[PDB]
Amino acid sequence: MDYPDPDTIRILITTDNHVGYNENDPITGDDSWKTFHEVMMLAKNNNVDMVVQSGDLFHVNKPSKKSLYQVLKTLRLCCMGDKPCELELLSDPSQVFHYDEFTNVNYEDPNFNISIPVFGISGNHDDASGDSLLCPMDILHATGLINHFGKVIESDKIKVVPLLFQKGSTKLALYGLAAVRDERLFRTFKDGGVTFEVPTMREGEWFNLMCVHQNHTGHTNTAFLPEQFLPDFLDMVIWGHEHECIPNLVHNPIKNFDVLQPGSSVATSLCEAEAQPKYVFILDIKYGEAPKMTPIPLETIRTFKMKSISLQDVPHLRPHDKDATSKYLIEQVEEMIRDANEETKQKLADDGEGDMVAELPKPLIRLRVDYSAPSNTQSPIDYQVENPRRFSNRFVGRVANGNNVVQFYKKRLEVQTLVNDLLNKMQLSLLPEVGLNEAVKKFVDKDEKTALKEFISHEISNEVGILSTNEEFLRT
Amino acid sequence: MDYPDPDTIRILITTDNHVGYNENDPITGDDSWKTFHEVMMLAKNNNVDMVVQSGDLFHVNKPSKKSLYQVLKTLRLCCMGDKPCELELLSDPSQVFHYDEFTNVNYEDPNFNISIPVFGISGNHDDASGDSLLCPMDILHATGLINHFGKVIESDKIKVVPLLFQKGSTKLALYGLAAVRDERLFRTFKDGGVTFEVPTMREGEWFNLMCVHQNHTGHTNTAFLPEQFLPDFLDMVIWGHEHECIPNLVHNPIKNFDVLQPGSSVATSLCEAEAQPKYVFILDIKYGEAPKMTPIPLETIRTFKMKSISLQDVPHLRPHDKDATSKYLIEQVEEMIRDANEETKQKLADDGEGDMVAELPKPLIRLRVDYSAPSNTQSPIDYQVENPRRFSNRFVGRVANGNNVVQFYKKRGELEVQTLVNDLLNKMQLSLLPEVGLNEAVKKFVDKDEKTALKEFISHEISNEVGILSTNEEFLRTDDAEEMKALIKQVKR
Amino acid sequence: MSAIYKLSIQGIRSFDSNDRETIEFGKPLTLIVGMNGSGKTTIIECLKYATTGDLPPNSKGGVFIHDPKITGEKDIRAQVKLAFTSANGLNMIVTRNIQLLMKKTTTTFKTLEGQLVAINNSGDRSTLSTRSLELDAQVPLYLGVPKAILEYVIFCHQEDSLWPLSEPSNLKKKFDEIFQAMKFTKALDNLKSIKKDMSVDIKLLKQSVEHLKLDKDRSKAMKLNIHQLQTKIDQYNEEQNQIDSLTHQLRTDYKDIEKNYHKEWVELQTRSFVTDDIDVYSKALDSAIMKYHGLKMQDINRIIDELWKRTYSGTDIDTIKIRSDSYNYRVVMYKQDVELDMRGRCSAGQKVLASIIIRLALSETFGANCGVIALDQPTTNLDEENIESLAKSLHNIINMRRHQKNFQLIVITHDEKFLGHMNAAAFTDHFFKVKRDDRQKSQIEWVDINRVT
Amino acid sequence: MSAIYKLSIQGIRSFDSNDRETIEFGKPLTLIVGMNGSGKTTIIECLKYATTGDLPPNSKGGVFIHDPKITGEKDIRAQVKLAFTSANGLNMIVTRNIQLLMKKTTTTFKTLEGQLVAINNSGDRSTLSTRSLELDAQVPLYLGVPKAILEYVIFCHQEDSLWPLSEPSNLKKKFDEIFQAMKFTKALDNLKSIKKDMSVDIKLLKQSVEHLKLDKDRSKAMKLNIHQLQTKIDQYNEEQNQIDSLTHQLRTDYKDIEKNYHKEWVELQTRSFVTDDIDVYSKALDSAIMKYHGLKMQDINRIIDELWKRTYSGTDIDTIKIRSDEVVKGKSYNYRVVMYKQDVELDMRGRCSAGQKVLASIIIRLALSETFGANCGVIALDQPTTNLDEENIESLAKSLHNIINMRRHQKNFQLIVITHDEKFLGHMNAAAFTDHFFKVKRDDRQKSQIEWVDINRVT
DNA sequence: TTTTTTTTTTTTTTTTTTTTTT
DNA sequence: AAAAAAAAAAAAAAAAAAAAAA
Ligand SMILES: Nc1ncnc2c1ncn2[C@@H]1O[C@H](COP(=O)(O)OP(=O)(O)OP(=O)(O)O)[C@@H](O)[C@H]1O
Ligand SMILES: Nc1ncnc2c1ncn2[C@@H]1O[C@H](COP(=O)(O)OP(=O)(O)OP(=O)(O)O)[C@@H](O)[C@H]1O
Ligand SMILES: [Mg+2]
Ligand SMILES: [Mg+2]
Ligand SMILES: [Mn+2]
Ligand SMILES: [Mn+2]
Ligand SMILES: [Mn+2]
Ligand SMILES: [Mn+2]
């Protein structure tokens, strides 16, 4: 892509890379880092002025050696260069990088040659932890290859300070809020807690950009960040923390700003949200005209096919057996293994590589089966389904989903009564049934400790009395 | 020190920094990275050309976020500068840095301003152990702040490619070997499996320096690597993994090289090895004369006092009580607390603080006491001493290690059948059964597995002695149980 | 539904007898982290003592109280106090006082009067009961759960965690109380204590029978000899002192024999019939109890199976179930459509996981009116895979049981890896750390969530 | 000092009955790791069965054999082979064959003949014993330790790990066979078993005696009435059929009464005297046994005392001790482990946490396998770090390192460790002792397998 | 001052498996 | 094959005792 206009700031937008996800997986173990290298190479040769990363660069709070080393390899082979960047920092960086003595952007440092400065915030996974409250982006900021911005020292009184750039005649204000707990963030936004210091000098030509890493919509009551608690002076919001990619911009009517949801680069969960095609976006800020955006799809995302079936919705399947359910499930997984291999081969033969058939990388396959009993049949046992870990172990070698190809889920006379029906049977030859069931009933319900001894002892004494008055009983 | 001669290559040698020891300790939680920072500052403004670390920069295999952050902040501040490095590389770097696409020294990189390169081998603590065998120094090499050299791929065959440097008219050959298990590198050295790639040109002009990180001496027979396996062309050896700082060059008479044992920057185990003054040394290689060493003491090392006593030597210490010895240990520890505080104050008011008084850092105190029983008394109970942690919790607020002030150590069929039962046998005193036939009735039972041997013995007695008493008609006329016992005792005597 | 709010231990076990340590429970998760011997299990012991009124196992000598020999005093007084809201919404507080008075020789343990109060919205303190006998019955009745659920499922002891895989009699005894069928099991044990004494008596009667028979022989013979002597005298009258002697013997020794003996016989017969009837009813009244057990066990087995399916990360066992049919009462495991008894044929980790699954399945079928459950060291003998799967399953259970009124999961652990997969920081902003002070008593702190490692 | 070298399992528990998995035990450390349900504890079960010869607890359905209900074969046979070296340096091999027939719904379990060979330096295979009953006495004798040491101390089962903190009778039972004093306890059990029988006899005798008394109350009265009638007839001769009747009654019914009864009484007396004599010696053969339990367990308390101090990271307990004192009525013996919390003595059972009673058990086993296990330097720790916090895990690792260093200046010493947790592995310095660790896994057919892997492969 | 009740601890019944005798 | 004791290990049950109800 040709060089931007001298008055055009071009930025690459990525988020939720989750480097270090499934590190030890024998097949999909390098998937996360390789995709990040592709993202950071789609910026080196796209001539972007800078890139912004909306959190979750690492999957874990304490990245491993291989995660950290493979993120420093791409940050050193793609950011270091000889062509100086054309962004002049108008503000004072010490108010934005107040954590340490490295209080200026990395590309102003005389000791480093930086051609593409990478700006990033923290996420809900690679957040501050330890005695010193050190983020994983603080260990990258020290290195000099990234500049972490938008920390929250105190989570109750938050003040967001922008970074003010300008390329010739186009200005840009880069507000950034890290990922804080949504219950506390809502409680802070509710009562004048979060404040933004919008620039006062020559206001009217800035492009106000914000990076957030909160929930867009929450399933609970008050555990998400409303898209209405932000300031109306913003012009675009880069929403992280959501892994579904949305290539378009959802213009927010009443606040006049467009929310961008870039999604994720790796699939950390096999759901319907992460089956959507992934993208990385390129903004183009130019004074006077609209900010045109170009989504460029990632070419390193492992092929993912998802189907969610219900066993009660398909006929000829009776819950009592298992040998006829696991024959239909196999035929349902085998058709979408072929569906994904065909897609992988077609996409590999749609970029100039159509003259060779290679060893296709295995896809990620998920079948979510609802093994619930139907409404009409009122029985405890539902459909019988094999062990998921062993059922999906018969597809090994054909699918990158080693142990989880299928996931089974379910869609959403107290004694005496039965004891009184037994009375007829129990036929004693001296004790009356009615006085004894009632001799114990009384014992049980009325809590009269001594009743079953006394009933027996009394009924004995009456039966002894009746037998003793018959002189014929004593001669036999 | 001032600017060195243009013909001199000046090196700052340090090892065993262990950045991360006691990371979470409230008091001594920052003594490792602070002293590493002091070492790098003593390198920045002593104008050393390069610093070589010979192992154990990190305490753990996976360094934490505080250790990595502090080491990166230290390296960034006092390794980068406008002044170009005056070292000239003569070897091909790819042979030495054979791990990645970063195959050149950091100070020759076009997009870095390294003014004093930091080299370094890996240690036995921060060694390569992972899915892809990455050590903590391979991360730092990726940042461009150090250059990790001397990395072994296969343990069976080892090739040692040196880094060849030249400044002015002085040439240097930096050899480096990582830390691999001593009792395997011993085998590799034994059957000629270690080779040194000497330079091809101008033999007899290089200062051959080697950074080894193995056990210098083996107290047990198989615990170390000897100095007889190292080649004779070396001019100096920098021995790591040894924390006892020996500030002199131990000369090897036959192999003709000097061994150096810098020691460590932090005391990782309270003992006498780490109770010697600790230094970081400076080498001053120049062609024409012998190198000149210059130890410079470290001034950020907590004051450590070590005493070791055996409890039995001191008289008037009776082992049965645990309070007359506690009152002695308490006063001994409190005696060597004031020595440590006096030394701390005397070293803090002798560098430019002879008029200002501040809170002295709490010293490290360790008393080793031997609660072994005296040689004269062989009773199982030795000296009785209280809980080591509760005894050391008495000095909180006056000692850095509040839980390990004191350590306690020691300086080192069936009882002959009825042998013990014999006493009881004679004292059993029954009134019908004979003792001798019954001890022997059970001995036979137990001794010669005669399952029913006991059984019959008793039942002969409920036969033989029935009739025998049935033969005295006087026994059957006496209703008194005391006269009956007297008669039985008289028939027995 | 019911929910617990605060607990105030004092003088119990490791705690100080002159302090008041307080821990407040939050929703939907509570985290307790400490060292060994801190007091983490004592908190759950106090919760169970407050709710049901029974001490931890193996505490005969008053070892539940802070040891007098440590302190040195004589009159020690503990007091556990709990604040909770009932199932219907009423706010209540329960107090329980105990004493460990020590004499020169022996130490006497006695339980003082407790207190239960239903505090209204405006602090309308009105006591409900005082004596501990009714305090053991009002609190489980107000919470909504039976007394067995509170002590076997919710506040299960750490050392009795693996009760589902114990001897058949123990399982039957513990499912009798859960199913509220203990009344009839005590009626059977009282009908058995009518056959016991009875049997002894029968054993006596028999001896008597022999004797009586002898006496009965000694009367017919003398009457026949008297008649033979009388008819000989009548013959000599047509042509005495032996009769006089035999008549005096019959009048003195053999008088009331024909019917005294009659009644003895009658009695014996009565005993005989009393036997059969006690057994027969016992067999029929116990078949009904086991039928009720097996009938009320289907809903538990249906949610045991769905939990095992998504929690056990292994490829050997398909499902797991509890089945009744002394008392062939066991939990079986299925390995590809074959049933095998799990006990003595499993491992430590599988047994631990099975017990956790069984308790979690019983908590949501009988503790539907009390969303509380305490897991004391859940991750023992579990590998990395099962730790991760258990944490994910607990997260799913918390999510599912929060559109209900509440769910309070108390987690006690010092295994750091188990916290990560459950998102402890996403459910709470703090946790409680139990630690001994410099005088060896236990303290309960209030630590920020990010300060855990 | 003895040493074990290689074990081969086939058919036991989850292992396949048509294959064979082996494991070589290195010195001085062996590591076994795996998942849940792998077979880690089955290895220790088979080692204990090879050496002593007893099945795991609760295995009465033949559940120590690969169950035929899932394989579908009637006759199934297992085998366990251990290749150890004797205490006096002799290479031997033990084999143990087991059969489980399933003809009908009933399964029969049987122990076929094994063999103990003693290979010479020239491969001189010589089967010196074949009966399994002989093997259970030979193998412990060749190893050098008593059988009870190999059951409870060395190859202790996982579920029986915390045996030092069990009931006093269950504790004396374990310590009786450790001290080789079970013979006199068997004698005491015999002196108890005869007693009961005798008591029954007494009862019988009593009843008989009562009858005798009745007869002795009678007979003489008839003799007195006969004499009264005789002297009346003598008076009438000076001036019979009643005597004839009473004499016939005495001749038929009351004949041999005078001696009989007396001898019965004598017999009863004898029984009474046997009760006293059986009791007196018995209450003394126990006082001379428990005087030996507390005498032999004296250097055992010296090593628990110096292992506790150097391992327990806590401020409450000072030391622990095992006390074996006589006694209350219903407690048998006062055999329990006590703890000294600041020089006050408290019984550890019932007032200790789950981690303290684990550390005490491990320490007691370690101290036992230093005095009564000095001829066989093996100790199998199965999941040592259960309910142990960070500090105790670290200190236990350091203490095991110190034990390995101290006990290996002497002759052979081996330490098998079964675990799955990273902290213990990191703290123990595992890689400094071996270059590998065995990993038990289940293959695609649910059969357990043992694999030899690199030391630097445990992440 | 005396009686029920629950908990531990120890002691027993059953049932296989060897071992004997063949 | 066939049987008849011994040994031993689980599962259930019976004393002892201190607390609680009377
Ligand atoms: N009656 C008592 N008097 C005094 N101290 C006691 C008493 N009972 C127990 N203790 C001590 O208090 C501690 C009991 O606490 P607890 O058993 O709850 O610890 P825990 O947190 O469960 O430890 P773990 O992590 O090992 O489970 C133990 O250290 C024990 O020695
Ligand atoms: N008799 C048997 N027949 C067939 N399979 C069995 C038998 N007994 C047990 N198994 C299976 O083999 C496994 C072996 O158990 P093992 O004791 O080896 O597990 P483990 O290695 O100890 O792991 P953990 O201790 O973590 O559970 C058992 O858990 C069970 O799943
Ligand atoms: Mg506990
Ligand atoms: Mg196991
Ligand atoms: Mn994310
Ligand atoms: Mn996120
Ligand atoms: Mn080292
Ligand atoms: Mn070191």
Author numbering:
A (entry chain B): 1 to 412, 444 to 507
B (entry chain A): 1 to 412, 442 to 522
C (entry chain C): 1 to 239, 1089 to 1174, 1184 to 1311
D (entry chain D): 1 to 239, 1089 to 1176, 1180 to 1311
Task: Quote the study's own text.
The Mre11 complex is integral to the DNA damage response (DDR). The complex is comprised of two molecules each of Mre11 and Rad50, and one molecule of Nbs1 (Xrs2 in budding yeast).
In our structure of the S. cerevisiae MR-dsDNA complex, we noted that 18-bp of dsDNA [modeled as an (dA)n-(dT)n duplex] is encapsulated by elements of the pair of Rad50 domains in the MR-dsDNA complex. The dsDNA is positioned above the pair of Rad50 head domains and sandwiched between the pair of Rad50 head-proximal coiled coil arms, anchored in place through a network of hydrogen bonding interactions. We can trace intermolecular hydrogen bonds between Rad50 side chains (-T111, -S169 and -R1201) and main chain (-N58, -F109, -T111 and -S169) with backbone phosphates of bound dsDNA (boxed panel). The structure of the stable S. cerevisiae MR-dsDNA complex presented here appears to represent a “closed” complex, having a rod-shaped structure that is similar to that recently reported for the C. thermophilum MRN complex in presence of ATPgS, but without DNA11.
